[PDB]
Amino acid sequence: CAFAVDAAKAYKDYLASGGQPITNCVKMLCTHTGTGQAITVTPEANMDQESFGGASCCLYCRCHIDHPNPKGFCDLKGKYVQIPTTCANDPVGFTLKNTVCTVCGMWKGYGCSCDQ
Amino acid sequence: SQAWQPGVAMPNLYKMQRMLLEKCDLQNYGDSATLPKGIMMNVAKYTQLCQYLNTLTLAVPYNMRVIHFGAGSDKGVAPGTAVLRQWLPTGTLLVDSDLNDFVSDADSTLIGDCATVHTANKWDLIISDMYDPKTKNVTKENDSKEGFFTYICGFIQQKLALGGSVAIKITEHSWNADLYKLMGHFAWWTAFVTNVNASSSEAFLIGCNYLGKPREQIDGYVMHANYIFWRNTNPIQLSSYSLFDMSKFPLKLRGTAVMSLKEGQINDMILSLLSKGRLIIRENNRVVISSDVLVNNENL
Numbered sequence: 001c002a003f004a005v006d007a008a009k010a011y012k013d014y015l016a017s018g019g020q021p022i023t024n025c026v027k028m029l030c031t032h033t034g035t036g037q038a039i040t041v042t043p044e045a046n047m048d049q050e051s052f053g054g055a056s057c058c059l060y061c062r063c064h065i066d067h068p069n070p071k072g073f074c075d076l077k078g079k080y081v082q083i084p085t086t087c088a089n090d091p092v093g094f095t096l097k098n099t100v101c102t103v104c105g106m107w108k109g110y111g112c113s114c115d116q
Numbered sequence: 117s118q119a120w121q122p123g124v125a126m127p128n129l130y131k132m133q134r135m136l137l138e139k140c141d142l143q144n145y146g147d148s149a150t151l152p153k154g155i156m157m158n159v160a161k162y163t164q165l166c167q168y169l170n171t172l173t174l175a176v177p178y179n180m181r182v183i184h185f186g187a188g189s190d191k192g193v194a195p196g197t198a199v200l201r202q203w204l205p206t207g208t209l210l211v212d213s214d215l216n217d218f219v220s221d222a223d224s225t226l227i228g229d230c231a232t233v234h235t236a237n238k239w240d241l242i243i244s245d246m247y248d249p250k251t252k253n254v255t256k257e258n259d260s261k262e263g264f265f266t267y268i269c270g271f272i273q274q275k276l277a278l279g280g281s282v283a284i285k286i287t288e289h290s291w292n293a294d295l296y297k298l299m300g301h302f303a304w305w306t307a308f309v310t311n312v313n314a315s316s317s318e319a320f321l322i323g324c325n326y327l328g329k330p331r332e333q334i335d336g337y338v339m340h341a342n343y344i345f346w347r348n349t350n351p352i353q354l355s356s357y358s359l360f361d362m363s364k365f366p367l368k369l370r371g372t373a374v375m376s377l378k379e380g381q382i383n384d385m386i387l388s389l390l391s392k393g394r395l396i397i398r399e400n401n402r403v404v405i406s407s408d409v410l411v412n413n414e415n416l
């Protein structure tokens with residue numbers, strides 16, 4: 001039996017259909033003088049970013065579904081995720097659609113400069 | 117002026133009165149602060165609370181243990197927990213709870229009536245934002261309430277480390293006389309109104325550095341009356357100013373010392389160090405929690 005629910009696809013398609021992005025993502029007050037790293041133990045937004053509570057920005061946490069991880073561990077919960085201010089309308093979409101560079105810790109494409 | 121503060125604490129002369137309990141009638145009742153863009157009320161509220169706690173003598177040991185009751189929200193998330201975990205030093209053990217399910221950044225979350233919650237270990241900081249929606253159905257004299265307040269009083273007396281602190285949300289009608297009495301068992305206490313909710317009768321009842329015995333005997337019925345008197349005769353300007361300076365927000369890790377100690381060993385020098393935020397007393401074992409679950413077979 002190969003069957004599993006593909007929630008990532010579901011949301012990506014709902015957005016593409018023009019669905020209203022998940023809301024009530026929990027944005028933090030911070031100095032916005034941080035590292036700009038993607039996922040941190042305290043808010044690290046820079047002037048181009050908003051910082052949010054991780055759990056509230058995670059599609060699995062918010063949807064009450066299992067994490068796509070053998071051990072079920074969550075990358076975001078218990079942490080703060082920095083979101084480009086230009087995508088902070090859909091923090092859940094952003095974290096799902098994007099990737100964190102294993103080397104510098106910035107969002108691949110939204111801070112990662114390891115190709116230069 | 118008060119508007120650049122995170123909030124306002126009950127002036128001491130009000131604490132010292134012997135008022136009778138009147139109805140609460142605030143001149144700005146219903147007004148809403150302008151919140152910075154995209155910031156939830158309860159992020160602003162908790163931010164201001166933590167900004168004020170930064171001005172007291174909290175014990176802040178290594179491996180701090182913090183418990184947060186009433187941490188859920190109609191949104192399914194825990195804005196309060198997010199601010200606390202921000203404010204608290206990294207690696208601080210944060211447990212939270214609520215009656216209804218929610219998603220949290222706490223290290224561990226318990227869902228159910230708070231009276232079902234049990235913990236083997238003691239705590240250095242207790243936060244409650246619990247509030248019963250039925251308190252809105254005012255049908256009689258504003259009497260001392262029980263329920264989760266009865267739990268909270270017992271939980272403090274049984275599981276707050278000496279030197280630990282509390283902040284417990286009250287309102288005009290959501291209040292408890294023993295909780296006020298128990299404030300007399302801390303080195304210092306106040307009622308703190310945040311500036312973003314200055315238009316509400318809400319306050320956080322803060323007990324700073326627990327001593328396990330009364331410094332002072334407090335009539336809780338009289339003291340809530342004093343508190344309503346203060347609120348009734350001191351209108352507070354809604355203000356969000358403090359939200360814009362987060363440079364000093366983090367709680368300084370004081371590395372406060374932790375000793376196990378027996379009741380015989382608590383002398384006036386120990387009691388002095390508790391009073392100053394310089395000592396915590398409790399076991400330093402592992403943190404273990406549980407929720408009591410009632411079992412029912414609904415069939416037949």
Ligand SMILES: [C]O[C]1[C]([O])[C]([C]OP([O])(=O)OP([O])(=O)OP([O])(=O)O[C][C]2O[C](N3=[C]N([C])C4=C3N=C([N])[N]C4=O)[C]([O])[C]2[O])O[C]1N1[C]=NC2=C1N=[C]N=C2[N]
Nearest residue numbers: 140141142145247249251252254287288289290316317318
């Ligand atoms: C997010 O956190 C919430 C709040 O932030 C915080 C409390 O804030 P509040 O609502 O402002 O409360 P309050 O009116 O100041 O005090 P009260 O005890 O509710 O008074 C009861 C009753 O007495 C009257 N009263 C009271 N006061 C002070 C008056 C006034 N009348 C006037 N003309 N002038 C006034 O000054 C009025 O009829 C009130 O209803 O508690 C949380 N919370 C609230 N409700 C719920 C809830 N959480 C979950 N579910 C809920 N349903």
Ligand SMILES: C[S@@+](CC[C@H](N)C(=O)[O-])C[C@H]1O[C@@H](n2cnc3c(N)ncnc32)[C@H](O)[C@@H]1O
Nearest residue numbers: 158186187188189195196215229230245246247
């Ligand atoms: C204003 S809300 C909490 C909002 C939350 N702290 C936040 O950060 O947005 C009041 C909470 O108190 C909880 N509550 C009320 N009575 C309770 C009880 N006996 N046990 C546990 N939770 C209770 C409610 O379920 C409700 O979520």
Ligand SMILES: O=C(O)CN(CCN(CC(=O)O)CC(=O)O)CC(=O)O
Nearest residue numbers: 231263264266267268269270271274
């Ligand atoms: O049943 C409980 O465990 C908590 N109770 C309060 C009992 N307390 C002791 C006290 O009366 O102070 C027990 C406790 O908090 O550990 C709350 C309630 O009756 O709604």
Ligand SMILES: [Zn+2]
Nearest residue numbers: 058060061074
């Ligand atoms: Zn998650």
Ligand SMILES: [Zn+2]
Nearest residue numbers: 101104112114
């Ligand atoms: Zn990189």
